[PDB]
């Protein structure tokens, strides 16, 4: 019956919405972004 | 009684920094402080001046 | 304070007095604040809304290439204040044990 | 009896005082029993009620109002919320 | 070094103002930290220890930059989530303004909003690689805000792509590399600080990614209570570094009390898991428990408070319960010695960590179960040194601790009214492998039997100088007779809970049939009937109106019989009219008659009267209701049937009886009268 | 307790009244002549209100006797002082106290 | 060799579990895939140990319990190839085996 | 970071393949010329047979520097082991093997039943059967 | 459903039968809802027992001069008279 019952996002307090947004952004945007600093760091440290 | 004996060591043998080191070790070990030892050392050593 | 500002003290005694000042007055508050600095609880205040990654500028499109000076500006993360008691040895001790 | 709309109000009166009698003297009511009163007698409406938002507001009202003080005004306004929730599917309320 | 230590301490305290921080930065490096002696401290060719202090300063400034990034992200979240919520309201408005023209599309759009809010946010946010309107409703106007902010964040962290540094990250990297190049650093702590700083500078997104788990946002109204909770948490954390004493115990108790009273502990459990409060409290508890293991558990009150706090932390939410399930094994390790405090225990914490959670019960580990089974075996083998020192007679085994371990095993096996087959089977095998767990009564080589053991325990209770020391801070410490009865009741309760389910038995699973056969072999039926038939002492009015109330803590009680009834119902089961009538005549009906007779005002609210009420309502009356169909065609025991009906009705007409208990009684009466 | 000896004169007209705050500069010495406290080192005058039991009865009587702008030596007996318990780490048990108190102003 | 024997016992038990069922489910196929990957790596390691050839390692394995593990794999391989060939959807798992 | 330093990147041209091999060798040289092999052996010996992220990272680094059967790294490791004559390395390796797990039918059944059971509560609010 | 439910349909039917006057369906302008409330409460308002309640409603009719009033406030304002006359009649604990 929960599926029939609606769960609007806009009926959610701003602070909980912010926490959920932070988690989702971390999971989908920050984590997916790829940066290959290993080669540069190793070369700099070796020189 | 042990703390007072260690302080009497300073009293009777002189101003030896190794006794001070022992008293310092009594207070703290591996980053954990023993409040009873700290308080007893303070009470028995400092107020006499 | 006189030991701190003294210049002729032996090195061991100068270091000892500096460390004694830190231990007597500042060590506990420093420890508590360092423990609390690991977490970021951000109230939704107008000051928080005012925060931006880059200072208002025009140097570059992705904000000014120059950052703001680190540690300078508005920080709204909650950190409990420091509490200190005056050193006074003429006040009455608590009647209870 | 009398005018039909009036009779409807006395039906409200009697249904609320049914539970007032059990917990309080005649008029005093507690949410402890107002929850059962609403969820039982308005069971017919919620079956056909599709305003998930309003029924959720009612489910929030019940856990908000556990403090347990209520009167006729509170009961009638909340059951009015329930009936408008049920019927607003039937009829547009904007 | 002294001046830099003082400056670093003041900075970490945060006392320094903006102008002071600017002066410190100018001293560190004039050119780089220049708003709008020339040589800086970094370029001044200093010794290694001074370099360590400078590294501490740079660490502070890097931490401040990380804080700035986190706060900026939080503010952008504040704005962006408001935008998304407003547009979501608009979209729902239009979708409801849609008069079900095409269900295939109406349901497709409305499934979005039927989904939980976290998945709603995920779906809305999922447009990083590009998505059309149908998959992602967000308009391009809203999307561009996030794209711009993400580009800004990458630029700030430097992942978005000189002879002078021009920035803090460049300055730190250049300085660390230059120091390492110039000299072979001989200070391990200096090397560690240098390379930690270098790694932080190189991996900007990694540091923010690791920091975010600890980032939380709260409404403006919660600020005061959150600050108070932070003060209490800081106190508790400070007590991690001091050996526990009286003052620290009192402080810890006060802090835990205030934390439990505070609202944030309920409104934001996620904030608490992020803060790690549960782990801090557990570390304090285990430290003090480990302290003086051989002697005793010093500061029992603090341990009780910590155990209560952790159990209630588990109760607050399921996620907290899983967090404590993660540490279960640690609590089981520390739960070796207990009951010397008589309050809450780490064993209670472990039980709460798994109570009423099918997922966690299924995830429970055989190693964890075997540890508790080994503890139970040890209890069945050796006696309790604390009781022996107190002066209690040496019985040779520890029913007191055996009962606690059995309680944990019961909570593990039995979940939400249904037995967990895996845990039940594992526990049954583990118990049979170690027969001493069953206790000396069921101990095979010379076991007297369960009925004989319970009768012997009753005689222990009756006889002084053998029940107790007989040479009372909590109701006269403990009583050996009641302890033995409680141990056997708990054992039989656990076995009955381990009993397989009826639907499995009907399906014919060989494993379930074998387990039920093993349980029947362990526990004979006649012993259970005799124990259920044992007479309970009833309050009586004597000696000039004095109430002779039996002492519950030191006497046989209805709960011991209730466990036996549960075993009889689940394992053996009542399927024959003759057996039902026999058990009713011998054991149940006398207890019901006694409960009816204790309905008078004098004895109505007595402890034994309430115990009998609970026993009947929760064990017997449900059983008779389930067995009601068997009462058809019992014209031969007409007198007994009439007496039972009258007794049940008299119980129904009873005072000091809860509504649920009255409901059970009335349901039993209608069920009987339907088939009689 | 307490004995008061006048080191320097005061006005002689104004004396502290109950519930009235006193600002003072004090220097605490043990009866052997060992200093244990002094506000002048902290550079901040000590402020205390009479009749609220904030300071020991030796102060509560000596400062009351003193007048505005007066400097006086107060000899406070052990029992009027912290007494048998003492102040651990600072004052030994059963120690008479000698104080050099200047009453700056009343507010 | 001992780890390989533990693995082959586990795989034989899993195959006996799934023998009755007509079609292996997705989770069963995934677990099979992980087990066969690990077994493949262990076999590659043993082959690397013995190739060259290393007479000492050859004799050690010959005297070891490798033969029982190979027997278990032979049984499992025969039965699993039959069962998986009867079903087309499990072609990828059959290729892995 | 050191492990990723060694990349290990239609059939390519024969010059392409040898040239890729040469970068892999140079990248492994950057590490094992500075004691990375001895560090890996010392870390594997220090772990003392308790599995964890530390030994996992050590093994990954060792694989990275040994990829392609680097003979120079192999000799550097052998010389260190024979010279130090420590048993801790192989004792830890044996303990790690003994700790390595295998297929478990009881665990499989538990996971199947847990997955079968579902949350009545909203997925966002509750775990909803996400466990390792 | 219960007879309370029938009372609810009674209220909703009266509200709609008089909303057909001005308001679309579940809306109704006060210029007309006022006539509804006095005409239908004519018995109650005529047997009014709380002068305070009657004067509050007589001022409400003018206070809500907006030509739009929702069903919640209609039920509230009718209950204002109803509960007042109620509490006068019965003891009120």
Curated annotation (Swiss-Prot), chain A:
In-chain residues carrying the UniProt-annotated modification S-nitrosocysteine: 3
Compartments where located: Sarcoplasmic reticulum membrane
Organism superkingdom: Eukaryota
Post-translational modification remark: Channel activity is modulated by phosphorylation. Activated by reversible S-nitrosylation. Repeated very high-level exercise increases S-nitrosylation.
Summary of the tissues where the protein is detected: Detected in muscle and myotubes (at protein level). Ubiquitous. Detected in diaphragm, skeletal muscle, esophagus, spleen, submaxillary gland, adrenal gland, cerebellum, brain and in testis germ cells.
Similarity comment text for this entry: Belongs to the ryanodine receptor (TC 1.A.3.1) family. RYR1 subfamily.
Comment on protein domains: The calcium release channel activity resides in the C-terminal region while the remaining part of the protein constitutes the 'foot' structure spanning the junctional gap between the sarcoplasmic reticulum (SR) and the T-tubule. Pore opening is mediated via the cytoplasmic calcium-binding domains that mediate a small rotation of the channel-forming transmembrane regions that then leads to channel opening.
Quaternary context: Homotetramer. Can also form heterotetramers with RYR2. Identified in a complex composed of RYR1, PDE4D, PKA, FKBP1A and protein phosphatase 1 (PP1). Repeated very high-level exercise decreases interaction with PDE4D and protein phosphatase 1 (PP1). Interacts with CALM; CALM with bound calcium inhibits the RYR1 channel activity. Interacts with S100A1. Interacts with FKBP1A; this stabilizes the closed conformation of the channel. Interacts with CACNA1S; interaction with CACNA1S is important for activation of the RYR1 channel. Interacts with CACNB1.
General function of this protein: Cytosolic calcium-activated calcium channel that mediates the release of Ca(2+) from the sarcoplasmic reticulum into the cytosol and thereby plays a key role in triggering muscle contraction following depolarization of T-tubules. Repeated very high-level exercise increases the open probability of the channel and leads to Ca(2+) leaking into the cytoplasm. Can also mediate the release of Ca(2+) from intracellular stores in neurons, and may thereby promote prolonged Ca(2+) signaling in the brain. Required for normal embryonic development of muscle fibers and skeletal muscle.
Protein's recorded name: Ryanodine receptor 1
This protein's encoding gene: Ryr1
Curated annotation (Swiss-Prot), chain F:
Localization per Swiss-Prot or TrEMBL: Cytoplasm, Cytosol; Sarcoplasmic reticulum membrane
Activity regulation field: Inhibited by both FK506 and rapamycin.
Catalytic activity: [protein]-peptidylproline (omega=180) = [protein]-peptidylproline (omega=0)
Record PTM N6-succinyllysine, positions in chain: 52
Enzyme class per UniProt: isomerase
Membrane topology: Peripheral membrane protein
Entry EC no(s): 5.2.1.8
InterPro entries from the UniProt entry: FKBP-type_PPIase (IPR050689), PPIase_dom_sf (IPR046357), PPIase_FKBP_dom (IPR001179)
Keywords: Acetylation, Cytoplasm, Isomerase, Membrane, Rotamase, Sarcoplasmic reticulum
Keyword Nucleotidyltransferase set for record: no
GO molecular function, one term: transmembrane transporter binding
Superkingdom of the source species: Eukaryota
Residue numbers carrying N6-acetyllysine: 52
Recorded GO CC terms: cytoplasmic side of membrane; cytosol; membrane; ryanodine receptor complex; sarcoplasmic reticulum; sarcoplasmic reticulum membrane; synapse
Any Pfam family matching the protein: FKBP_C
Span of domain PPIase FKBP-type: 19-107
One biological process term in Gene Ontology: ventricular cardiac muscle tissue morphogenesis
PANTHER family cross-referenced by the UniProt entry: PEPTIDYL-PROLYL CIS-TRANS ISOMERASE, PEPTIDYL-PROLYL CIS-TRANS ISOMERASE FKBP1A-RELATED
UniProt subunit comment: Interacts with TGFBR1; prevents TGFBR1 phosphorylation by TGFBR2 and stabilizes it in the inactive conformation. Interacts with ACVR1B and SMAD7. Identified in a complex composed of RYR1, PDE4D, PKA, FKBP1A and protein phosphatase 1 (PP1). Interacts directly with RYR2 and RYR3. Interacts directly with RYR1. Interacts with GLMN; rapamycin and FK506 abolish the interaction with GLMN in a dose dependent manner.
Family: Belongs to the FKBP-type PPIase family. FKBP1 subfamily.
Function comment: Keeps in an inactive conformation TGFBR1, the TGF-beta type I serine/threonine kinase receptor, preventing TGF-beta receptor activation in absence of ligand. Recruits SMAD7 to ACVR1B which prevents the association of SMAD2 and SMAD3 with the activin receptor complex, thereby blocking the activin signal. May modulate the RYR1 calcium channel activity. PPIases accelerate the folding of proteins. It catalyzes the cis-trans isomerization of proline imidic peptide bonds in oligopeptides.
Protein name, entry field: Peptidyl-prolyl cis-trans isomerase FKBP1A
Organism for this UniProt entry: Mus musculus (Mouse)
